């Protein structure tokens, strides 16, 4: 990743506080690219 | 041709693959639905033909680096030093 464990995503304006765990449970997602640093 | 042929074709090769895994993280979507939907080659394995047949098998670029690598391979079982990350990085290009 690029963050400690737990994250924070703003869902349309509403913030979801998780692990990344629970988003990289599946490894194709767009959460799993939200989770890992890129340009 | 003077500044290490094998190295910046090994930079070009990883750079289209930084960027096909990046144009991989763009469109997911169409690789799961069209790619089936159509009945056609998936567009990563479409992604990696195309390059391999633009650098490749382009007649130029292949016959350069096949004269090369079988220089660098003759050279460095002489006894001399080449570069063998480039060597080893244009094996794995090659499978």
């Known amino acids: 990743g690029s963050v400690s ?5 703003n869902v349309g304006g509403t ?3 998780t692990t990344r765990q629970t988003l990289c449970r599946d490894p194709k997602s767009f959460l799993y690219r939200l989770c890992q640093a890129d340009p | 041709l003077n500044n290490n042929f094998l190295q910046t074709l090994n930079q070009a090769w990883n750079d289209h693959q930084t960027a096909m895994v990046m144009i991989r993280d763009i ?3 169409m690789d799961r639905v069209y790619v089936q939907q ?3 080659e998936n567009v990563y ?12 098998r382009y007649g130029c670029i292949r016959d350069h680096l096949r004269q090369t690598l079988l220089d660098m391979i003759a050279r460095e079982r002489k006894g001399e030093v080449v570069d063998r990350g480039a060597i080893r990085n244009a094996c794995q290009m090659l499978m």
């Open chain 1, 5 to 9: 464990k737990w994250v924070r995503l």
């Open chain 1, 15 to 17: 913030y979801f506080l």
């Open chain 2, 27 to 29: 469109l997911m979507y």
């Open chain 2, 38 to 40: 159509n009945n056609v």
């Open chain 2, 45 to 56: 394995n479409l992604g990696l033909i195309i390059f391999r047949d633009q650098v490749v």
